Homo-oligomer: A and B are copies of this chain.
Amino acid sequence: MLDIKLIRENPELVKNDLIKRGELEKVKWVDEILKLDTEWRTKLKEINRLRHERNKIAVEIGKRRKKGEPVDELLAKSREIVKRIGELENEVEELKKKIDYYLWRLPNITHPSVPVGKDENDNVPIRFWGKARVWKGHLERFLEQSQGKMEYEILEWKPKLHVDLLEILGGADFARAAKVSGSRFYYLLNEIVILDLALIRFALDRLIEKGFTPVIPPYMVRRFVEEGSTSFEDFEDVIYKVEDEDLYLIPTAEHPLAGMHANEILDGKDLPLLYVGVSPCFRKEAGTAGKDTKGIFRVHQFHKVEQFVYSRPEESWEWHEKIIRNAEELFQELEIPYRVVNICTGDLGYVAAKKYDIEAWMPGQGKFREVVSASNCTDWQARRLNIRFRDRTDEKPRYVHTLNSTAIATSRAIVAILENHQEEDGTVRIPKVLWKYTGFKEIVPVEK
């Protein structure tokens, strides 16, 4: 939700951002909000005018109580004021709603460090890491995406895609999943199941060590926490609702982690609050027609360990940088070459004020694909969920700043590992880091 004060104090700043985001259809709202914000405040002025009047008309009837007291009239102007007052109050109540309706539907204001853009072809690579194994036939595309800024090694043989690797490794059954649940669902098997749990614990351990309290939240939540975590557009695009219940399947532990302190007032001394959640994630993937069919990259369900941070507005950005790094450290340990990216305004999304994505090099696809996403939501969620805080019990509670970020979303990490650590015969070597969790050190294909 946007801050009424902001629209009042700089409509041009907002209007321009709405345009950087490509949401022209809404710039016309800025004016309509003030239009209403204005009627709202004059009607207030009137009510007070009115309240003061009744006081005056009150003492006046008293003065006449001693006189001829022809107060039949005054007692009528009174009944009028009270008639008016309520009507106004109601009229005002109506304006606040129309105003709020629009405020809840406006994207967070972007930070000036956000590059201006149209789509994802305008995001901006700002850091690289690792030695990318590149197939001869990808050389140019790789170099365009790496900006020559990434170290690599050429491969004569062609790397296989994760979907194939899974099959030769006996790691999954797609056919049957489709029979049982439809498309974009899967049955994970053997080593791959351990690997999955393996990545969860790993992610868990690290964030805990860095002082995050581990939490397993409810997988189903009440509509308001979804309305307070993303835009109302997600209700059609991604969230599943269960029949006859005010219950929605969470698409990320982020949401329940945020609704955790809805309607509270935190004690500034506890801040920052550091949570690392684990939960299955459910997403409709309605907008995707056929961009990633069969496989476990763009699916309806998956596991993800998530970082959630409650901070004071002055430490948020410093934190935003901290979490994305926490995320980076994990993949480095997984020996997964990648590139962090600063997402532009057009592809930024309603909630984030600034977003950092870690796209991993995929030796098979010959391109970088999102693997983690770190966002600073400033006060957008707070303002919605009414999450405020105070330093001294004396006065005014201020809204806190919330930040979220993937640690490891298992499905997409497994792809990364599979494509990045494969060998000519299909064998996949597990990063040494994960040995204590997996047991095995590699996954050989069936037929040996």
Contact = CB atoms under 8 A, between A and B. Distances in A.
Contact of A242 (B222, B240, B260): B240
Given A182-B247, A242-B242, A193 B214 contact: yes
Contacts of A196: 216
A246 B178 CA distance: 13
Nearest to A245: B240
A207 to B, nearest CB: 11
A214 B225 CA distance: 35
A204 B191 CA distance: 11
Contact of A186 (B218, B240, B261): B218
A216 B204 contact: no
A301 B214 contact: no
A219 B280 contact: yes
Q: Secondary structure of the A side of the interface?
A: mixed
A180 interface: yes
Given A176-B261, A242-B243, 10 more contacts: A173-B260, A177-B217, A177-B218, A181-B220, A186-B218, A189-B214, A190-B214, A193-B215, A240-B247, A241-B243
Interface of A: 173, 176-177, 179-182, 185-190, 193-194, 196-197, 200-201, 204, 213-222, 225, 240-243, 245-247, 249, 256, 259-263, 278, 280, 282, 300-301
21 contacts: A177-B217, A179-B259, A180-B217, A180-B259, A180-B262, A182-B222, A187-B215, A187-B218, A187-B260, A188-B215, A189-B213, A190-B213, A194-B204, A194-B214, A197-B200, A201-B201, A218-B300, A218-B301, A240-B247, A242-B243, A242-B249
